[PDB]
Amino acid sequence: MVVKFMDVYQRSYCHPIETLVDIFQEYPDEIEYIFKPSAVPLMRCGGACNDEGLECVPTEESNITMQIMRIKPHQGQHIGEMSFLQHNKCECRPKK
Amino acid sequence: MVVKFMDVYQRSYCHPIETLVDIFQEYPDEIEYIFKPSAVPLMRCGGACNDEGLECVPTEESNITMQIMRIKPHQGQHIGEMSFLQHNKCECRPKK
């Protein structure tokens, strides 16, 4: 079959999407660590907007705490809680 | 609460993930066109593997056809069918 355009557009439109997010990218100051897993799944805004003058951005957010394996040379592996930001609501906004 | 490590790793482990994929990326030979929506959601392999000599790749795939709006600046627009690859099964394999 074929997905009809209106259906394709609505499902591709700006909304919260579970996304794999690199841990080190979120915690840029932890330069001595390697994390396992290296990326975790987090709800993040993504998708289209009606006119190019707009971008998909969060209008509501919250945090989630996860146990992450933190590995630094000579310190063996540690399992530690790390907090990550999630997007609960998304809307199209003018590119500032 | 806190998501326990075993669950964190399991949810982060190589598997098919609904991913927003840039159409022009899947069809880089379609220069003249602006697609709308510019990206669509497709199931794509993503996630961690146990050791770094491995990468998450598809081991079963399929196709999905969607009606996409094709725009040629100052030339009008057409709604047309476009085929996209989908990943149905993923596995961690050597980075040959």
A67 closest CB neighbour out of B3, B39, B81: B3
**Consecutive H or E run containing B12:** helix B5-12
Q: Which CATH number fits domain B1-96: 2.10.90.10, 3.30.360.10, 2.60.120.260, 2.40.50.100?
A: 2.10.90.10
Of residues A25, A39, A9, the one with CA closest to residue B79:
A9
Could you tell me which of B89, B11, B43 has the C-alpha nearest to residue A37?
B11
Q: Which of A17, A38, A39 sits opposite B20 (nearest CB)?
A: A17
CA–CA gap between residue B41 and residue B52 (Å, rounded): 28
Resolution (A): 2.1
Residue B91 CA to residue A13 CA, distance in Å, equals 30
Q: Cα–Cα distance between A41 and A63 in angstroms, integer?
A: 13
CA A29 to chain B, closest CA, distance in angstroms equals 22
Probe site for chain B from A1, A7, A8 (most B CB atoms < 10 A): A8
Question: How do the domains of chain A map onto residue ranges?
Answer: 1-96
Distance CA B53, CA A19 (A): 23
CA distance B86 to chain A (A): 14
